[PDB]
Structure 1
Amino acid sequence: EVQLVESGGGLVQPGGSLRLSCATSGFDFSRYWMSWVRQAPGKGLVWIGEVNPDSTSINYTPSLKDQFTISRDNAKNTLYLQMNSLRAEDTAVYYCTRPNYYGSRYHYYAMDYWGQGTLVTVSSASTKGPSVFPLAPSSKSTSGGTAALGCLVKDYFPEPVTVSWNSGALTSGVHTFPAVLQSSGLYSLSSVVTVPSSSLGTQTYICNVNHKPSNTKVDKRVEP
């Protein structure tokens, strides 16, 4: 099935440049128009622009034509977003999308597939990878037949961190908390899971932590 994976997000200094990439799978990339949309934290969706199969038509939203250059590599099935002279107002999640349901002799489409997005943070601070600590299940974290366990992802910058449990095989009862800004200007979050109390000595629980801005990947085993 259609897969869209953005990468390149992270920290950019004001006036700095960055190139985002969107690697695709599951479709003949060379037949589709491709698009980029952004979303500033807690704000709405803003269409940046589009590019046709042979790059003879590249259209942008007028107010962003200076900050962005869109291109594509058909041989690599990849979409690119060149970001130039970035401002604080450019901090956003950048989504690559696939236009489809094309209008007949009319420039219309609907974006049928979207990537998970890449967060671009515009700031003068430095990147920091996090420490990962277990939140061990105990009788103090057990309500009858239900036990809670988790991972504490501490002291990272910029956002985001992603957490999955047992390489995405555990999703029920998972709560990953919004990150909190600590007094040090570094972020911190926890991811928790509620599980059967009887499975504690049996089942293995591993939180998979990923902080792409620092290329930090940590698999922490959480034991009772």
Structure 2
Amino acid sequence: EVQLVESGGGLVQPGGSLRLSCATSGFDFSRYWMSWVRQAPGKGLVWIGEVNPDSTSINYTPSLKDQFTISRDNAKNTLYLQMNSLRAEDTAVYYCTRPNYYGSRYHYYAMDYWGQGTLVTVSSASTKGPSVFPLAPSGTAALGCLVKDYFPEPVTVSWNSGALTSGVHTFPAVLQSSGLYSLSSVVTVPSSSLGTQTYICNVNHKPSNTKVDKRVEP
């Protein structure tokens, strides 16, 4: 099946530049138009622009045509987004999409395939890796991990290298008064499984290249 994976996201300073990539698999990339859509945190969807197979038609949302530049490498089956003079209002999740559903005489499509997105944070603040602390358990028991004082978002949390998925809740991060983020990841398990089963939370923070594997014990 069609696969779209974006990279290049992270922290950039205001007025700064960044280049996003969207690696693709499962289709002849050379024969399709490609698009970029963005979503500011907790806000709506914004179409950035599109590029045809030839790169002879490159259309943009007018308010963004001055700082964004779309391009592709057909031999590498990769789509690009060059972002310049970035403002705080450009902080968003950036998605590459694959337009199709033509069969029309006119320039019309629906975006039938989207990638999972890459978050771009525009801030003058510095990167900081998290401190990971266990939330030790006391029928059903709850245990967790406290991922504290990191910048910027996101952090990814998995349990037992993806083996434990049910009863997992990874809370949205809250911005603390220090200017740094903090979150918790919890899981509910049988109280009988505590002193027998091993529980390890896997914390990843790509902006600071931090990888923590924390064993949670009662």
Please state how far the C-alpha of 1:29 moved relative to its aligned partner: 2.0
Q: Taking structure 1 as the reference length, what is the TM-score of the superposition?
A: 0.91
The equivalent residue for 1:141 is: none
The equivalent residue for 1:183 is: 177
More off after superposition, 197-206 vs 95-104? 197-206
Deviation readout 1:170-206 (Å, 9 max, x if unpaired)? 2211111111112211111011111222222333322
1:4 has 2:4 as partner: yes
Residue 42 of structure 2: SS of its match in structure 1? coil
Provide closer, same or farther for how the CA distance between residues 63 and 192 of structure 1 changes in structure 2, counting only shifts above 3 A: same
Please state how far the C-alpha of 1:220 moved relative to its aligned partner: 2.0
Provide closer, same or farther for how the CA distance between residues 4 and 166 of structure 1 changes in structure 2, counting only shifts above 3 A: farther
Provide closer, same or farther for how the CA distance between residues 167 and 29 of structure 1 changes in structure 2, counting only shifts above 3 A: farther
More off after superposition, 149-158 vs 167-176? 167-176
Unpaired segments ≥5 residues, structure 2? none
Provide closer, same or farther for how the CA distance between residues 206 and 25 of structure 1 changes in structure 2, counting only shifts above 3 A: farther
Provide closer, same or farther for how the CA distance between residues 37 and 148 of structure 1 changes in structure 2, counting only shifts above 3 A: same
User: RMSD value over aligned CA atoms?
Assistant: 1.7
More off after superposition, 78-87 vs 128-137? 128-137
Deviant stretches of 4+, over 4 Å: none
Please state how far the C-alpha of 1:64 moved relative to its aligned partner: 0.4
* Counterparts of 2:32 and 2:162, CA distance in 1: 30
The count of aligned residue pairs is: 218
Deviation readout 1:108-155 (Å, 9 max, x if unpaired)? 111112122111111111111111122122xxxxxx921111111111
More off after superposition, 62-71 vs 210-219? 210-219
Residue 75 of structure 2: SS of its match in structure 1? helix
Provide closer, same or farther for how the CA distance between residues 14 and 208 of structure 1 changes in structure 2, counting only shifts above 3 A: same
* Counterparts of 1:222 and 1:115, CA distance in 2: 33
* Counterparts of 1:200 and 1:21, CA distance in 2: 43
Provide closer, same or farther for how the CA distance between residues 174 and 126 of structure 1 changes in structure 2, counting only shifts above 3 A: same
Q: Taking structure 2 as the reference length, what is the TM-score of the superposition?
A: 0.93
Provide closer, same or farther for how the CA distance between residues 101 and 216 of structure 1 changes in structure 2, counting only shifts above 3 A: same
Unpaired segments ≥5 residues, structure 1? 138-143
Residue 104 of structure 2: SS of its match in structure 1? coil
